[PDB]
Amino acid sequence: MITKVTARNNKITPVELLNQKFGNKINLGNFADAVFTDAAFKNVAGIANLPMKAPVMQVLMENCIVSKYLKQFVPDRSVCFVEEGQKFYIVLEDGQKIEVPEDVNKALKATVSDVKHWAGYLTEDGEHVIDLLKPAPGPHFYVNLLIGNRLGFKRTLQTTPKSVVDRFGRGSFRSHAATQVLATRFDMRQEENGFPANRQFYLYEDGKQIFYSALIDDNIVEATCKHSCNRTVIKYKTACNLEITRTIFLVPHKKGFPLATELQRIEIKNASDKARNLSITYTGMFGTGAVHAIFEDVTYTNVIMQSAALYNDKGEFIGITPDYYPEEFKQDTRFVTMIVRNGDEKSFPQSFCTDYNDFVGTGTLEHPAGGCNLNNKLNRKGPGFFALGAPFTVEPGKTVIIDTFTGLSSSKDNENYSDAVMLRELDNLLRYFEKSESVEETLNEIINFHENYGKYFQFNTGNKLFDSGFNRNLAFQVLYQTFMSRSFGQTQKGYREIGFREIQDLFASMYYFINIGYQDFVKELLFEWTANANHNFYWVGKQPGLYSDDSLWLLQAYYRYIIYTKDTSVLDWNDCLKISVMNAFLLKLAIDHLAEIATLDQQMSELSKEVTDRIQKHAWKENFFARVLINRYYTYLGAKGDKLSADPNIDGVYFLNSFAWSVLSDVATDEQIAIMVDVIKKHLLTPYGLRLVTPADLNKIGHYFFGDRENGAVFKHASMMAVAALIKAAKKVKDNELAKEMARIAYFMIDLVLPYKNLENPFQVAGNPRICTQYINTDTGENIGPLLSGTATWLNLNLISLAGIEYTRDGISFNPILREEETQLNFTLKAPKCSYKFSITKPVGFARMESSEYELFVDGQKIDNTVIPMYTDEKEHIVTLKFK
Amino acid sequence: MITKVTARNNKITPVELLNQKFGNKINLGNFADAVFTDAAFKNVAGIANLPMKAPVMQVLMENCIVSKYLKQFVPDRSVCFVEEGQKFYIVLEDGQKIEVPEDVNKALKATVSDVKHWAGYLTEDGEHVIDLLKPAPGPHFYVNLLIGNRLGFKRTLQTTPKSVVDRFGRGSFRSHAATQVLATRFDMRQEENGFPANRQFYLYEDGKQIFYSALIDDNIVEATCKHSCNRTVIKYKTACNLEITRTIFLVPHKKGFPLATELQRIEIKNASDKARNLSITYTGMFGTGAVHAIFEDVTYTNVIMQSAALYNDKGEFIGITPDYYPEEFKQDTRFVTMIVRNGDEKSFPQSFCTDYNDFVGTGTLEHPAGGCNLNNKLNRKGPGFFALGAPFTVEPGKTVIIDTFTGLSSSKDNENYSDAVMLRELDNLLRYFEKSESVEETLNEIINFHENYGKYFQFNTGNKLFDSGFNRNLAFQVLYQTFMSRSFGQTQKGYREIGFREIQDLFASMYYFINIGYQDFVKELLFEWTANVYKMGYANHNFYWVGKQPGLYSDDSLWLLQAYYRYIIYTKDTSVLNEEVPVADGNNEKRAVRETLKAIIQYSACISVGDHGLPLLDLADWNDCLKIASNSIDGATKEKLYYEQLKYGDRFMSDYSESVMNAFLLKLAIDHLAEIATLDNDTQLAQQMSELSKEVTDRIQKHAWKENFFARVLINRYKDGSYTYLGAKGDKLSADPNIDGVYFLNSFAWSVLSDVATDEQIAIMVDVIKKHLLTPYGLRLVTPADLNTATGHYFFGDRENGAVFKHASMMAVAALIKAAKKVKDNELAKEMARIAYFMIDLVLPYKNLENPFQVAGNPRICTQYINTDTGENIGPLLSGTATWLNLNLISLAGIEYTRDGISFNPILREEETQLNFTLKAPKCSYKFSITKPVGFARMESSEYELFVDGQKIDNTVIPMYTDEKEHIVTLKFK
Ligand SMILES: OC[C@H]1O[C@@H](O[C@H]2[C@H](O)[C@@H](O)[C@H](O[C@H]3[C@H](O)[C@@H](O)[C@H](O[C@H]4[C@H](O)[C@@H](O)[C@H](O)O[C@@H]4CO)O[C@@H]3CO)O[C@@H]2CO)[C@H](O)[C@@H](O)[C@@H]1O
Ligand SMILES: OC[C@H]1O[C@@H](O[C@H]2[C@H](O)[C@@H](O)[C@H](O[C@H]3[C@H](O)[C@@H](O)[C@H](O[C@H]4[C@H](O)[C@@H](O)[C@H](O)O[C@@H]4CO)O[C@@H]3CO)O[C@@H]2CO)[C@H](O)[C@@H](O)[C@@H]1O
């Protein structure tokens, strides 16, 4: 009797119904937004001719003038705007082209001003400049990830602090494990990582509120955000003529500092002719110690703690701390402090509030009722809300600098802990940043650390956006994922520890660490993983012996480390495949790796010959290597004749990782690779990339709609593993025509993963332009989070492998697979005791050493041997490759 | 180097520093608010002489005029306002009383206008009228609880819907178990039960936004909320001259309706001379099916679902539903619908939005950017946000009525479920409420159900606020807690099932149900609880659809007997005693009630006992924070380890700590079933238990009576014999230099309730109680104690560390009232009634409105405990307090059901001279009326005359009449 139309419908879209109605009459261009005027969907309102896909109608409807303008046409009939000349017209379906009124014309020119840049843009350094007024392509697009630095300090892996910062500075900030410094929010929307107050502040002038850092109002003229490598800067310009600048970053560790400390510097310049008397109120919510109780018992979280005030030597209030009664929540101690600088004169906040209800009162968080006058009451209960108030004058031209210090001390660093330990460490901190210049110096310390960390591998291509993306941005993400695994990002908030299989992240970061003299730290990591085999850990281990794969990955870390350093003085993967030929390929590589490890230190050389011939005989099911080999009852899963498909047109399930790992372990013969590549291109290759698996009815042996995650998505970690295999095969195989095709697919799939290209057509693609995301939805092509993904690790490994580098017993095996369009490729490479300056020239077309003729020069002299040795002479070597 | 001042460590308060500075100079009155002008706390700003404690300075600082006025005095020096004459003055500490400016005087008169009513007020019907502008005394004070009605439908207890509504209509709404219809919020603040959008709406006029139901702005003139029995009404009046009225209530169940449906009727009257063209946008967030994932994986909760639109026969959009992919989240199907009425013409919404980001846009939730023009896009992802838009004209004088229908259908009612089942049921619903009058009729159906449910017991005292509080409000809470236990309120949001020991709630509601002809439902409940008992005598600890954790906590089983006893005695219905009920042990096996009650007593008396005869404690008992014993055997560990020793009757091989509380429960359980068996025409089973109680009693009173007080846990486990017991003189377990031992209030209470303690023992325990357990804020649960290695979780005053726990303190009052009727000493009896009435005045919700910003709580609903530092009544609003407060007030009024009928023995207050109440029985009625002179009076001591329909009976027992006529009972104390 009653109908149900879901979002996924073979039905027509607004833009399709715009073309069906106005296609022949007006000129619509390559792109055009539109929206339905009614709930029955019979009519549309649209705008013709945009420079890209964008939600222009959405932003148009925010203007009241345009909404009320359409009232005399919609919803009874359909309409479309058209930009003939510089004056806008409205087209009715009954012919007439009416010239729109001047106020309606005012909006339409302003709205369609810079649609090509609505998603922001990248600098030459790969920083994302964002406009706070424009809409987001998705929940991760305007997000930045910050990280501390605990290198050369006790337990780096567990203690290094971490925080997430969106374009308005919103989010949350953590110390060791899941310990919250600022409150994380566990609500219905991805967009809300933190409690809304976190990091925000108000400014008042003579009683009235004139500013709120999370509210763009009529008084704000310019408002931009620049996300960069390990800091975020947000600028504003008011109509009243103030230039406000927020800078957020995490403090790197010094002797005697708190375990976790986040710094926000707020500059305020008075650009007008007269001086102004203002006041700041800085707000935020501390995270609870009793995180589980937020669900089981919110009233418990409130009664177990109380607010406390902090005072220096001179009896001056400096800030607020939450004080807990239970001993288990006393092992961490939080704080927030403020320091107002006014040229020479440092000062502290003169008022405070610690009850959200009292602070907001009659109003809202954007316009509190009790915001100017704070009541200075310490709350007997939680939650740990705070507001720190201070007045200041700013003379005309001069700038007032306000520095905040939110943070945490902990028993995990200090033996015999108490709140007294936090009090010592907070003093150290406030002493260190006494002088104003101190903060700008520590920032440049951070900036330089990363610029210098990235120097291990630097592409000098023509495309500046690729170079910065790889040299700064990707390098950083791979660093970030070494410490954090998949534990903390925008939407990744709940308890995921450090995962055993995220040792994978080390495979890429290892060479970067060693080359800034942290070979010690790389050893420290290896052993901490080696200690466990277990499936998870942080301080102690969780879900022990759960997954079959975990143990096997460890060998690949040791192998990579040992081979690079010559240091012998050291000694299932799919989370939705509940029912392993993959593990056979891991073990085979693990056996053959340790064979190479032992020689450098006959048992394993023989063993691999047995271990291989087990798989290739029984696991090779005619057309494709199997995935799960059932010997329990249905003979197998993952080939021709498994009898487990959910597609009339496809015979069987085909797992991409069965191909990938057969090649990576050197099991599959050239005949088998050429057969699997044809299977891959038929089914697993889509317009949006290589998908993880073909359709399959696992009920006879889901959670997501088709396209998301496991049900047929382009899972980018798995697809980068396939590219790793394709690149390996394109170097080795006999057939050059196959080699060409495998490199064709590798570079095709790389262009769908490189973050910077997300800014080409961003309201379709989304993702994040500086940070690799998890998967591409195969209905929309939308890059979906989280921002923590093995994609980056393997994207890093792959680009370098394409560039030619491959570390072996004798040194570097150099075998570059350039793009068919590229004629030049240049990159600097570092080694522990030397450097290299690589430079490859080739004619247009496919070229590799196994087929094409070439000359290979190292410091003049011309080696026919493709291996380049690891020099220890402390000098930049010039390597040149000329393909004929 | 750096100092740390905590809230509790902070020496002087602002009001104390106001008195230290202005005490001798000005007159400050009994009450006065103040605030510190600086962070060092050296100076204060205050207002002298308020009619009660109130946060007046807070509300004063919201006014900009007054904030800037103080800038020329604070923060360097201290200040106080004083109302000398009708002009306000500011007093400096350096003498001068300066007359404040006229704009500052304008505010101060307006602010201190009605401080006596800032927390609202109660009507004569016990409805709480609330002002949306004034601040709340606490997070539960302006909250109301709503409940559906599944009586005479499949699985009442599990399927009855429930919702919580604050003064702005904010909150969340649930169907069976923890299934969310509207989104619950699991955040940092108690104040936020729901997603903020839930139940709110906007109104627009000619492009602009002119209203938001959760924002009082300059355009709002009047804005009040009236919380009542099972509905909430919120009224507004705008400057532009609109009279907006929201009415929220849950629909009672009809044939073929959805399992859960919530109705909000929005009336909008145009009081002005000209007609207006407006539009409404109604918003809300559906609850996720994947509730766990909100914490573990928020992105999962979003991708597993998508929005869907609903259309009727005529191709007209009616509303929105969230559509899930996983089969496990397809077993419930949600909806929201709207119907705009404009006299004769009913209509549906013309637009919609389902992406929070698109709807809010550049703005905020209070002022969305995309609010007037909705984009009609179905979201491919969650979460389940919705906005339903409709235009309408309202002629001058006429009213536009908008009715919403948010709700849920489910497989738990319907066999072979799909989304098609929800679609059938939504049609039924929208057919039923087609006519406009229909909704006002179903409301009056609800109102009448409760007015008529309450008629079981009605006080007709002088105090109207007491009467309505007991007759309407308490009655309702006790109903609400029968269905919901402690599962769903404002702050009680996480998974708590139906607890076995919350059968206690039935003890009070039972007599109300039977007297509206739902003796069937009362039987249905009894059996559902009884089901969870095993063939042995132990039982499960909790349940919802299936029951779990058998014999885990030691008390649970024993409470069931008190339910059966109370039911049987009231109805004389031994036919329940011979009925077969599904066991929790194995197979599809039945056993008779007679043996299910025989086994329960046989377990706690013979099987699971210790050294000195009394029952074992296993893991724990009634106290949820008394974890002690090492290695506790489970109910079916013992059913496998009782078989091990033997290779009925003989005791279980252990030396575990014996719960002395459980000994009193078992003793009453044994003595109750003794009374049950005799009435079940049985001389043998009565003779079985009659002897048994004599043995069961003399076990306790000999070994458990530790000189000055009955013990709590009798530890019989340590070989060396250091620790002989817990809970008396000489236990050697106190954490107070000035007190010898731990003293548990429930050890007193249950010794009296089971009729174990002699009059000598009661008089001794009452002196112990008054020394330590009696505080200004009531009877506390236990004295300080180093039970050690677990240390405390709460500061002193909250919950377990020395709070006045009101469920436990009402159990103590039950004992005090019992003892005040029976005992020989009238001077003791007097004193025990003195304490009973003292503690009752700290629990009755209506008295919270006397000094509410100190006391908080909630004026219509009993809360959990009183903090003994502040006197603040702390939530949650679901508490055994109400159940026992109900039992206690009735027992004080004289009523006590026995074999022969009503044992009438009233303990009036010493101030009261009159007391009248109507009582209902299954086949008759009573009109009680007691007159006495000022002073203490009881039948055991004072002389009296007792009249029943004229004639004067010397027998104090009044029989249960079956003549269908109102009997007049009169008591005159000389
Ligand atoms: O394997 C590849 C890669 O995966 C990354 O792993 C992800 C998976 O991609 C993803 O499918 C999986 O998701 C969970 C989800 O987080 C849970 O919340 C959800 O829980 C359901 C449960 O399944 C139901 O039975 C129950 O009724 O409700 C709950 C929700 O309340 O289950 C799904 C899977 O079934 O999450 C994985 C991460 O945990 C990894 O990061 C990477 O290491 C892997 O290599
Ligand atoms: O006994 C009287 C009465 O109690 C009511 O029960 C309440 C108790 O009053 C209350 O003290 C208790 O509080 C819990 C709290 O809800 C839990 O969240 C919490 O959890 C801790 C845990 O203790 C730690 O070990 C762990 O590391 O962290 C979590 C928090 O993340 O534990 C406290 C107790 O210590 O809650 C009880 C409700 O279950 C009952 O309703 C009533 O029946 C009793 O008569």
Residue numbers in the entry:
A (entry chain A): 1 to 532, 539 to 577, 621 to 628, 664 to 685, 692 to 723, 728 to 795, 802 to 984
B (entry chain B): 1 to 647, 653 to 793, 799 to 984
From the paper:
However, when 10 mM cellohexaose was soaked into a crystal which had been grown in the presence of 10 mM phosphate buffer, a dataset was collected to 3.0 Å resolution revealing additional electron density in the active site cleft, which was interpreted as a cellotetraose molecule with an adjacent phosphate ion. The glucan was oriented such that the non-reducing terminal glycosidic bond was located between the phosphate and Asp624, the expected general acid catalyst. Thus, the glucan spanned subsites −1 to +3 of the active site pocket. The donor site is completely buried and does not extend beyond the −1 donor subsite where it is terminated by the side-chain of Trp622, the so-called “hydrophobic platform” residue that is structurally conserved in the close homologues. The phosphate is located in an adjacent lobe of the active site cleft that is closed off by a sugar bound in the −1 subsite, and thus must be bound before the glucan co-substrate in the phosphorolytic reaction, consistent with it following a sequential Bi Bi mechanism. Beyond subsite +1, the acceptor site opens out and the glucan chain extends across a wide U-shaped canyon formed at the dimer interface, such that the residues occupying subsites +2 and +3 also interact with side-chains from the β-sandwich domain of the opposing subunit. In the more open CDP pocket, two side-chains from this “opposing loop” contribute to the acceptor binding site: Asp297 hydrogen bonds to O3 of the +2 subsite sugar, and Tyr300 forms a stacking interaction with it. There are no large conformational changes between the apo and ligand bound CDP structures (rms deviation of 0.692 Å for a dimer on dimer superposition), although a number of side-chains become reoriented to engage with the substrates. In particular, the carboxylate of the catalytic Asp624 is flipped about the Cα-Cβ bond, to hydrogen bond with O3 of the −1 subsite sugar and the oxygen of the scissile glycosidic linkage; additionally, the adjacent residue within this “catalytic loop”, Cys625, also hydrogen bonds to O2 of the +1 subsite sugar. Concurrently, the general acid donates a proton to the glycosidic oxygen to cleave the bond and release the shortened cellodextrin molecule. Consistent with this mechanism, we note that in the ligand bound structure of CDP, Asp624 is within hydrogen bonding distance of the glycosidic bond oxygen, indicating that it must be protonated.
The crystal structure of CDP from Ruminiclostridium thermocellum reported herein is the first solved for cellodextrin phosphorylase enzymes. In contrast to the typical glycosyl hydrolase mechanism, only a single carboxylate side-chain (Asp624) is required, which acts as the general acid. The active site of CDP lies at one end of the (α/α)6-barrel of the catalytic domain and the substrate binding site is largely delineated by the loops that connect the outer ring of α-helices to the inner ring.
